[PDB]
Amino acid sequence: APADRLKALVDAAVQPVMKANDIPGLAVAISLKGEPHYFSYGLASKEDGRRVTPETLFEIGSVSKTFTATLAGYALTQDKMRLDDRASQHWPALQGSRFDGISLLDLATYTAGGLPLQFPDSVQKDQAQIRDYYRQWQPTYAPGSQRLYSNPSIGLFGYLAARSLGQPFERLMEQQVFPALGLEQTHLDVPEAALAQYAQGYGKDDRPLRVGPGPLDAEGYGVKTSAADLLRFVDANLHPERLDRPWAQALDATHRGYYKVGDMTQGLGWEAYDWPISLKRLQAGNSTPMALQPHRIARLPAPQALEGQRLLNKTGSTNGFGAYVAFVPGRDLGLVILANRNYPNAERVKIAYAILSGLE
Numbered sequence: 001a002p003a004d005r006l007k008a009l010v011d012a013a014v015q016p017v018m019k020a021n022d023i024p025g026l027a028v029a030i031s032l033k034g035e036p037h038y039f040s041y042g043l044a045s046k047e048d049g050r051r052v053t054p055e056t057l058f059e060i061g062s063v064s065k066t067f068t069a070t071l072a073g074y075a076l077t078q079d080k081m082r083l084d085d086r087a088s089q090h091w092p093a094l095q096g097s098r099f100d101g102i103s104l105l106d107l108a109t110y111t112a113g114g115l116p117l118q119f120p121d122s123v124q125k126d127q128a129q130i131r132d133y134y135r136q137w138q139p140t141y142a143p144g145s146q147r148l149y150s151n152p153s154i155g156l157f158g159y160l161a162a163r164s165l166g167q168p169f170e171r172l173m174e175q176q177v178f179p180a181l182g183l184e185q186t187h188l189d190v191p192e193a194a195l196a197q198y199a200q201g202y203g204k205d206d207r208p209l210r211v212g213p214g215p216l217d218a219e220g221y222g223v224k225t226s227a228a229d230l231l232r233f234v235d236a237n238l239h240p241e242r243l244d245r246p247w248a249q250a251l252d253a254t255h256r257g258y259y260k261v262g263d264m265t266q267g268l269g270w271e272a273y274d275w276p277i278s279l280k281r282l283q284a285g286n287s288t289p290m291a292l293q294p295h296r297i298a299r300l301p302a303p304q305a306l307e308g309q310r311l312l313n314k315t316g317s318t319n320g321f322g323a324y325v326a327f328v329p330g331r332d333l334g335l336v337i338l339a340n341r342n343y344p345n346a347e348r349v350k351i352a353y354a355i356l357s358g359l360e
């Protein structure tokens with residue numbers, strides 16, 4: 001009965017949403033009572049007929065920021081940087097710019113003062129162009145006052161964390177972070193030998209879409225991973241004490257909240273809600289206006305532990321993919337939902353909520 005009921009619950013949550021959003025392929029992984037459960041739907045490629053499995057690689061877009069935050073957590077708990085460091089401490093090229101007056105925490109939590117959603121189209125994947133972009137940028141409002149969700153903000157945070165460790169971001173992720181987490185199906189640059197696992201992404205008129213190079217792409221949206229590997233990462237987040245101490249501390253650093261906007265408490269990468277909360281409130285926290293408009297923050301008197309009766313989550317999208325991850329620390333419960341269409345955040349949350357409600 002238990003296996004039957006779980007399948008029935010996940011199918012009932014997933015199937016209508018896949019149909020309604022014309023999603024070609026979708027992978028679910030759930031961590032429940034210390035065991036993984038996988039549910040795979042549809043096609044990784046409509047053209048060659050490759051089916052989705054728990055090993056299929058999907059682009060996870062901004063969910064990558066939780067990995068970036070974990071690397072920063074490592075730099076922090078290793079005393080190579082502090083959250084109150086000024087940004088220009090870690091890149092001489094930024095000395096004399098406005099980044100003299102902007103903290104690493106500001107960058108990590110999108111409060112540097114109006115860094116935009118994405119780098120402008122004019123900025124290519126080039127160190128000099130990126131350097132010059134930040135050198136010339138001026139805040140719209142005071143650092144530390146308003147949240148504006150931003151790839152160049154947290155991207156710079158990750159880049160500076162790598163500089164503080166004296167190695168390239170991409171190399172640190174491949175050689176240190178992914179292996180520490182036990183992740184062998186997680187990539188910034190998918191090996192040739194693994195390309196058979198890489199799903200096709202689909203956009204308007206089902207044009208094929210896989211993510212191309214861009215400035216600070218690794219830091220902001222670099223990761224391709226499987227539902228199985230992403231759940232392994234969720235399980236590391238649920239039980240950081242199962243990892244060697246330096247990495248346990250790194251994961252813990254991503255479970256600390258610094259301010260609230262409405263119902264959401266902002267950590268490094270992760271965004272947290274009280275649990276239970278209504279589906280409509282969780283959707284609102286993951287909505288377009290939340291991502292696209294500046295919001296005044298309510299700063300906390302001290303960092304808050306993001307644990308117990310809370311839901312931690314992150315959305316992420318590329319042109320052809322849409323990902324969502326959510327977990328409840330106090331219930332040892334986690335889930336990932338990966339798809340090869342960028343479909344509305346509210347629909348991803350709707351699937352997750354149906355699964356979580358059914359388990360409760």
Ligand SMILES: *C(=O)[C@@H]1[C@H](NS(=O)(=O)O)CCN1C(=O)N[C@@H]1CCCNCC1
Binds near residue numbers: 291314316345
């Ligand atoms: C991350 O996925 C961010 C936004 N995250 S969310 O939490 O608002 O969903 C959605 C889109 N996004 C991107 O990183 N988009 C990039 C834009 C750079 C160029 N193309 C790659 C996609």
Ligand SMILES: [Cl-]
Binds near residue numbers: 117118119151214220
């Ligand atoms: Cl960007």
